[PDB]
Structure formats: structure tokens, C-alpha cells
Write a protein that binds this ligand. Sequence first.
Ligand SMILES: [Zn+2]
Length: 258
Amino acid sequence: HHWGYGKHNGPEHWHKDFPIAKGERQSPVDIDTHTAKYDPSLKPLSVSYDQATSLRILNNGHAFNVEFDDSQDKAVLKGGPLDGTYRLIQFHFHWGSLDGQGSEHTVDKKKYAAELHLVHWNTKYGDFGKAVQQPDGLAVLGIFLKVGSAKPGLQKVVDVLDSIKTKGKSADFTNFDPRGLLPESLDYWTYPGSLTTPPLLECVTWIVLKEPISVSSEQVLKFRKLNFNGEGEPEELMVDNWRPAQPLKNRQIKASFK
Ligand SMILES: [Zn+2]
């Protein structure tokens, strides 16, 4: 009876194994666009993905992770609200059963069809496992997905999902360029928060881009054919793997743009 997204093991149950679920800096949150203050001191974000080395894609029973070689400063995030250099380790998505839900962060209570998280760790802590124990350990770049025109840079991900249908399956996923998943603008909101899955650690600087990317209905429908279960187990479609908005408490959301 491990955590998941169902009626019996979903977000409202997580607190019983992970009491930090009811903590002071939990994610995601609703972004109230009228309350978020423009902070002219915020720098443009620097996304340096030219040398990114993707290695593998994994169905981990909750989502799929595209994994990167983070043994050197190749793909890094810096600038924005960040001090120092943060290395890309993996990306994944959260998505719904229907286009009207799926995102974790919301914008004035609007839910997007899905949300991409590019997860990076602060090199001053030397490895990911150490970084998640620190308040400034991770920087997660959040990008909304809406359903419309296809995102060509996503299709290589969509087309491999067939080979990692079930929990514990993996596939070789080299030479994927995550710049193909970015929107045009790097305007963002930022706030201090947490991992949105257990262990729900309060170690993330969230950077949520204002501009969504568009993907096609066929693309997101392929996400929805994945499975939470393992091979030859009762099929449970991998949908609605998102945590709802959590209380903002004593936090300010800052906008990079006016
Ligand atoms: Zn995530």
C-alpha cells in the first residue's frame, strides 16, 4: 500500500507516511497573477541545454522520467532567482484523464492539460541525494501544456512510450534535445516550494514559465495509454498523476515580467 494517485493512496493520504505534506512550503500552488509581484531584481533565466546528454527513459509507476548524464556541467540552469549552477538530471510530466485537468500549478485557478518539470540540482551539494536535503537544493522549471497544435520536439518522447508501457520498464533514449520542449518566452513566476511527490521535501526553487507550449490531442492521448501497474497486472491507466494546489501560507510569488 505505497503512495500513488488512486482513491485509496492519492494526495490526500500522503501525509500519513510523509507528514511534511502539511508543511509550510508545499507545492504546487495556485498562481494568482494579480497578487504576484513583479520583481525587477530578478534576472533573465539562463537555460544552457546545448550539450545535454539524454540517456534513458523510465516508467517508474508514477510518471516517465527522461534521464540525463549529470556527471558534469552539461545541461544547466542558472540566473533567474538562482544563486549558482543547477544541473539537469531528469524531466517528466504530470497529466490528466481529460484535457481540462492535469497540471499541478494552476494560474488563477486555471488547470492546464499537463505540466512538464525539468529537474535540476545545485552543484554546490555534489549529488542529487544530498541536494534534496537542502532548502536551495533543487530548481524545477515548470512548463504548462495546452492541447492544440503538435509540439514537434515532443514526438520522439511520444513514440517511445509504447516500449515503456508498464512500471519498471525502461528504454535507451539518447540524443534527445530538451530545447525542443521550451516555449518562446522565458518570462516566469518563482516561489520557494517542494517536490510534488513523496517524499515531498522542501528543497525546490520553483520557476514556472508563463507561456505554455502546445501539444496535440494525439500526443497527450499517447501519455494516457501508459500504465501505473507493472507488466501482467490489472491495467490502471497512468492518468491524473498530479497533486492539487497546496496552501501558499507565508510565501510570495514573484514575476520576472511586468
Ligand atoms: Zn513533477
